[PDB]
């Protein structure tokens, strides 16, 4: 019904080509009913730093979000601060001041193609996310076990219904259907 979904996009140097990542967003978002009283969406991108592409309450319509999403530019990154990205989506994106609706389910979708440089506090961050009831769906572009394990751990139990594997940027799309319904 009503969920506040924050998408955490990896935009580090390694991600390529950006267009595939955005197509992934399009397909995913277009299947949704966005609205102040519907599904809300906010997008966060990370690399060396983190930036709030757009807040949870920025757009009141699905096309407004669909259009804003496609306008997102890759900011690159010599590092992959996955930990920072998720923590930022948690401590910031999900605050009432940025459109976090009171008492509404909080859902986070993470997409990345590399071992975070902040492996250390990824444990802590995912932890804080659990304490705050944030459903987490993670996706790993394998374009590998130590990596796959890192990402699955970012997902919520049951790992299997919250984790997605992809061969490369391109195949991301071939998951939006399952991802979409899994988050239902």
């Amino acid at each position, epitope marked *: 019904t009503q969920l506040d979904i924050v998408i955490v996009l990896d935009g580090s*140097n390694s991600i390529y080509p950006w267009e595939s990542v955005i197509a992934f967003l399009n397909d995913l978002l277009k299947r949704m009913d966005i609205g102040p009283k519907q599904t809300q969406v906010g997008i966060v991108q990370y690399g060396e730093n983190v930036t709030h592409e757009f807040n949870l309450n920025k757009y009141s319509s699905t096309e407004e979000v669909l259009v804003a999403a496609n306008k997102i530019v890759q900011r*690159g990154g*010599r590092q992959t601060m996955t930990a920072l990205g998720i923590d930022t989506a948690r401590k910031e994106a999900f605050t009432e001041a940025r459109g976090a609706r009171r008492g509404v389910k909080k859902v986070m979708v993470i997409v990345t193609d590399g071992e975070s440089h902040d*492996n250390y506090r990824l444990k802590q961050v995912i932890q804080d996310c659990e304490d705050e009831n944030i459903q987490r769906f993670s996706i790993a572009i394998l374009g590998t076990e130590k990596f796959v394990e890192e990402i699955k751990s970012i997902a919520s139990e049951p790992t299997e219904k919250h984790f997605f594997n992809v061969s490369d940027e391109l195949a991301l799309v071939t998951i939006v259907k399952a991802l979409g319904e899994r988050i239902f």
Partner: T-cell receptor
Amino acid sequence: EVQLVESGGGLVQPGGSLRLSCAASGFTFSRYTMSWVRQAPGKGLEWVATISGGGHTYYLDSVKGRFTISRDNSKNTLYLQMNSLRAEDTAVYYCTRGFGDGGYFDVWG
Amino acid sequence: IQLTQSPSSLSASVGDRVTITCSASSSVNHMFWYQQKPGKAPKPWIYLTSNLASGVPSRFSGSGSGTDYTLTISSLQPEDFATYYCQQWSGNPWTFGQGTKVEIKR
């Protein structure tokens, strides 16, 4: 195998310029973030600049604004335009393919 | 982040066990190593801390975490004689250590 073949080195006068090119072959060049690394006479290794598969360029402070890293995926050649060269700049330069966000130097010229 | 290797120089005879230490001013998730032989360009030797490049003979091994990392040659060979550099990618600018030169003690 894979490889980078550099050319463009030489002698320039303090404050002048020059341009190194590096021909890539053996891999899908466009996807990797490439870099330039230098080694001064009797010195170690120094990261000069980097350009991602998407066009983001990065630079060591000392060469910031004096150097320009670019690429032309049409001809899988990487470039390092160097202007306002100073003495500190003298060294042997290596283009380099990177792994991941490019910090690991996969292949060298 | 600054990387300082030790020793900076070391002489050893074939068969000796060598261990280069790379200390970083700040902690990092991994460390990389390059092997440069005189007159040639550096060569990827050990990535992601312990992973050996493609050519690197199995006698080579890398290890570490936080601020202290290490490259080890269990059985020094007359061919392993070159200078090794550790490098980090966790902080900007990316940096190398001063390098550690290893010559054949005969």
